Each structure stands twice: as structure tokens, then as C-alpha cells.
């Protein structure tokens, strides 16, 4: 069977597993001729009925559409004469890992550059009518050269730019709990780019806190913490939040006041940074700041200015002795 347009993964040499997923889910590899570092991601099909996963087809279609400096780059789709592999340009680090490793240091300036690339990436995908739907620190990669890439579009979909007519009815259970915006927890099915910016807000907080700020155990619990940090969810700060079916049928604390800046105060410090986080963590999506304005927020245009990530990248080390040994005699 002739197959001139889907090469065998044999052209790459697997080097190592990336992370602790399944048997052969993600592999670091190199092109046998160019030496090009890539990551092979197997299309998982344990659940077989509806054939090739519409979820995979969406990812592929979206990956082939999105081409931008701050979005993960899909090189090609290969096969093993059977599995299918999405081949990506390899990025050495994910943000979740860099932040967990508290030995790595981030200057305010570097944090600025990180958020700038992230917001620029989100602008691009939203401009192209795509919603990421799986924002979280682990899906934000950073290359050895210091370039951030939005990754894992495995749960992304296209949305309609409809200010016009009918209501869209998109899949409601999307986005990891800890990063899920209020509107979704409330049953919203006609959501848009704001669900991703909420995530950009949660991630921004972590740049200082070093770990997810709202780790709910359940949807009801997740809503609890959002109320506790952002302020009770009322029609006063979110007009018409009333109409949500689940608005009633859900335990919902009523006396909470927005404590966003106070709680992050100790961690963040810089007022511009706290203001942007405050605007990103707004309950009502229509009032939540978008990527465009976020990019033009004073945070990115006030001293200290965005800098490259060379410094932060030098604090990432090669082993125990380098991390733990003092710098001297």
C-alpha cells in the first residue's frame, strides 16, 4: 500500500520518554539525518469504536492551521507500519516543571517576558478562532533558547465569531478543574476566548506562588475557592449570572469579598503585576481582560522591562551538587 505522504516514524531515533505518561505516549527523538530534536506524541486509541478520535482530528487540523512563534510547531504526522504519531519541534521545559523546581529563579523582568509570549500566543490562536481549553502550567513550554510555546491542543476546538444571531452550544466540561473559569463551572456552553485568559490569570499567579492557587477537589469545591479569592458570585459583579440553571442548584457562598490582591500581595509585590492578575481573574467573562489589552497593560511597559530568559535558564542546573553547592571557596 503506497503511502507517500505519511512517513514511518523510523526516520527518527527515539532517545527517551518524556514525562511519566503511558507505555509509549511521548518520546524525545532526533531526525536521523538532520539531528533535529523532536517530540513524538502517539495518538492514543484505547477506546476504539468511532474510529480515529475526532479529538485527534481536531488537534491535527488546529495544529496545521496555527503557525506562530509562541505556538507549538507540528512538523508532520508519522506512522509505524499500528500507531500514528504527531511529531513536534522539541521544547526542553514545561512551565509547571520550572515553577515546581523552586531552585530555578525568575526575575520580575523574566516573568514579564513569559507572560508577554503567553498572551501573544493566546491572541494569535483566538484571532484564528481557536479556543485552547486546557490551559495550565504544564501546557506552556519553554525552549532551551528561551521561547515560550503554547502546547497540547488535544482538547482545542474552533469557535464562532458570532456577535450576531444564535447561541453556540459547546462542550461544557472542559479545562482542568484548578484552571477552569467560573462561567464553565456554572454550566455555560456559549463561552469564548475568556476561558483561556482566566487560565492565563491562574498561571500568572503561579509565576510568584510557584504552585496552583486554587486546587479544588470537586467542581463545588473549585467554585468555593474562587468565591473565597475573587468574591462571591452575585448578579452585582456578574450581571445575569442569575439565569444559569446551576446558579440556584449549587452551594454558593454569598458574603465573600474579592481578596485577589491581598492574598497575592505577599507573593507578587509589584503593583502593575497585581493589577493585571486582578483583571485576568474577573468572574464575569465579558468583563475579564482580553489578550490584546493585557499585552498593552502597564505591567509590560514599565520598568523593569521584559527581558530574555537567559538568566532564569542558567539557574536550571545539571544535578544535585550544582544545585546544592555554594558559589565560592
Amino acid at each position: 500500500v503506497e503511502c507517500p505522504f505519511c512517513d514511518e516514524v523510523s526516520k527518527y531515533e527515539k532517545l527517551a520518554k518524556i514525562g511519566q505518561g503511558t507505555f509509549g505516549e511521548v518520546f524525545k527523538a532526533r531526525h536521523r539525518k538532520t539531528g533535529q530534536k523532536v517530540a513524538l506524541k502517539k495518538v492514543l486509541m484505547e477506546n476504539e469504536k468511532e474510529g480515529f478520535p475526532i479529538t485527534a482530528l481536531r488537534e491535527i487540523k488546529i495544529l496545521q492551521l496555527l503557525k506562530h512563534e509562541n505556538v507549538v510547531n507540528l512538523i508532520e504526522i508519522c506512522r509505524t507500519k499500528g500507531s500514528i504519531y504527531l511529531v513536534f519541534d522539541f521544547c526542553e521545559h514545561d512551565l509547571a516543571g520550572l515553577l515546581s523546581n523552586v531552585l530555578v529563579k525568575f526575575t520580575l523582568s523574566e516573568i514579564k517576558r513569559v507572560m508577554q509570549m503567553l498572551l501573544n500566543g493566546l491572541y494569535y490562536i483566538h484571532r484564528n478562532k481557536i479556543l485552547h481549553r486546557d490551559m495550565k502550567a504544564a501546557n506552556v513550554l519553554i525552549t532551551r533558547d528561551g521561547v515560550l510555546k503554547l502546547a497540547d491542543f488535544g482538547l482545542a476546538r474552533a469557535f464562532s465569531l458570532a456577535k450576531n444571531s444564535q447561541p453556540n452550544r459547546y462542550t461544557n466540561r472542559v479545562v482542568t478543574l484548578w484552571y477552569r473559569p467560573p462561567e464553565l463551572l456554572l454550566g455555560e456552553r456559549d463561552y469564548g476566548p475568556p476561558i483561556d485568559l482566566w487560565g492565563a490569570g491562574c498561571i500568572m499567579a503561579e509565576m510568584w506562588t510557584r504552585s496552583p492557587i486554587m486546587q479544588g477537589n470537586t467542581e463545588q469545591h473549585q467554585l468555593a475557592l474562587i468565591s473565597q479569592l475573587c468574591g462571591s458570585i452575585t448578579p452585582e459583579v456578574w450581571p445575569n449570572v442569575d439565569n444559569y440553571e446551576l446558579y440556584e442548584k449549587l452551594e454558593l457562598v454569598k458574603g465573600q469579598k474579592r481578596k485577589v490582591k491581598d492574598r497575592l500581595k505577599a507573593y507578587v509585590r509589584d503593583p502593575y503585576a497585581l493589577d493585571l492578575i486582578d483583571k485576568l481573574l474577573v468572574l464575569d467573562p465579558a468583563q475579564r481582560i482580553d489578550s490584546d489589552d493585557a499585552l498593552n497593560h502597564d505591567f509590560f511597559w514599565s520598568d523593569p522591562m521584559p527581558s530574555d530568559l537567559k538568566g532564569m535558564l542558567s539557574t536550571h542546573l545539571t544535578s544535585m551538587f550544582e544545585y546544592l553547592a555554594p558559589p565560592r571557596r
Partner: protein, 49 residues
Amino acid sequence: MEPVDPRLEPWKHPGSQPKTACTNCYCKKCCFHCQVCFITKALGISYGR
């Protein structure tokens, strides 16, 4: 056979099923009932044997 607004996102597109059943009649009108009737009746194209 019937124009569809291109600007509609794919999932917002109407189904192609004809509003009425496909008769077995052959006349300038029944031969243009839908794309299927046109292709099979008026052009005599068919996938079966």
C-alpha cells in the same frame, strides 16, 4: 443545489437531506428534486449494478 451561507461555521451548517421524499418519477421537476435525483434521473449516473 441550494446555496448555503459560507460564513457559517461548519457545525452551524444545515443538513443536506431533502425536505420531501425522493419519488421515482421522471419529469423536469422530479429530475431536479435534489442533487441525488438530478445526478441519477437526469444524468443517469448510479453506484449500483
